[PDB]
Design an enzyme around this catalytic site. Structure first.
Site, PDB file in Angstrom:
ATOM      1  N   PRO A 186       4.812  19.001  35.578  1.00 15.05           N
ATOM      2  CG  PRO A 186       2.741  17.959  35.469  1.00 15.05           C
ATOM      3  CD  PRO A 186       3.810  18.561  34.609  1.00 15.05           C
ATOM      4  CE  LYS A 237       0.657  21.824  34.273  1.00 15.94           C
ATOM      5  NZ  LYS A 237       0.763  23.240  33.817  1.00 15.94           N
TER       6      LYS A 237
END
Lengths: 114, 114, 114
Positions: free
Chosen positions: B1, B32
Site C-alpha cells: 500500500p 498488510k
C-alpha cells in the site's frame, strides 16, 4: 504518456540526463511518439517504506494504451532498472503503478483524446 | 500500500513520528505486512479548499485489495483522526481517495504483482 | 472535486488569484458547491515534455460525477485556457486527466460519500 516518480533521494542526485533517458525509454516501451511523453521526478520528499526513512520512491506510468495486464511486467523491469542505476533505490523500496487511461478521460492541446 | 497526502501545513509541523504512526496504522487496517507500506507526506503546498488558503489537504490510499466499498468508511475514520490529531486539519477541508489497484497494474522489486 | 497541477514554471508566477479563479471555475463547470472544491498547484518541478525541459505541466481533475465521457472535452477547453492565460504553458505541453471517482472511494469529514 506521463511518468511521475516521488522519492526521498536528494535533488542533487537527480540529473537532466535521467529525465531525458526516461523520456526516451517510455516512448520506446509504449511505442508512443516522444512528443507525447511527460516525465516528472520529485526529490527530497518526506517518505517512509517498511516504516523507515531509508531511500525509497513511488511512481506512476499513465498512458492511453501501451500499458496492459500482459505488458506491464516488462515495463517494470525496464523502469526499475533505470531508476536503480541512476538513483540507487532498492527494488523492495519502490512501487510503480500503471494506469490505462481512457481516451475520453485525458486532454492535450485543449481537447480530450475522445 | 501507498498513503500519500499533500497539504499547505508547514513542514516543521510534519514529524518522523507522524509517518511512522501512519505506516503502522495502514498495515493494521489493510491487514498488510508493513514491509509493503509506503507513506508520503508533502507539506508547504500551494492549495485552496472552499476557495480559501486556510489549512487543508488531499491524499490517496492505494492498495491491492484491503480497500473496498464496505471497508473504506472505517479506513477514513482512522486516517482522518490521525491527520487531525497531528496536523490539526479540519475534516471538512480534506479528502482521501481510496484506490483498489489490480495486481497486474502495480510493480515492486522489478515485477508486477500479476 | 480536486484539481491538481504540477509544473516546472516558477513559483513566483503562481498567484493566489490563479487558485481562486480555478476554484470558482471548477465549481461552475462541475455544478458542485465551491465548499467541496480543492485546488493544488505545484511549481518549480523537475519535468520534461517531448524530451525537453521547456515549460510544461500535468494535472488531474477528480470528482464524484460531473466528469464524464461527453463533458470532459468542454472541461479541458476551460482549464487549458485559464492555465495558459496565467502561466503561459503551451497546450501541446500539458495534460489534464479526468477521474470519475465512485462515492464509496473518497472520504470527506471522516466518512466516505457512500
Amino acid at each position: 504518456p506521463v511518468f511521475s516518480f516521488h522519492t526521498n533521494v536528494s535533488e542533487d542526485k537527480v540529473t537532466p540526463e535521467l529525465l531525458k533517458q526516461i523520456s526516451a525509454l517510455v516512448a520506446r516501451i509504449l511505442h508512443k511518439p516522444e512528443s507525447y511523453v511527460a516525465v516528472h521526478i520529485v526529490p527530497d520528499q518526506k517518505m517512509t517504506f517498511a516504516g523507515t526513512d531509508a531511500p525509497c520512491g513511488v511512481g506512476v506510468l499513465k498512458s492511453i494504451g501501451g500499458v496492459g495486464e500482459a505488458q506491464n511486467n516488462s515495463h517494470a523491469k525496464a523502469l526499475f532498472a533505470i531508476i536503480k542505476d541512476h538513483l540507487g533505490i532498492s527494488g523492495n523500496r519502490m512501487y510503480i503503478e500503471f494506469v490505462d487511461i481512457g481516451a475520453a478521460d485525458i486532454a492535450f492541446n485543449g481537447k480530450t483524446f475522445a
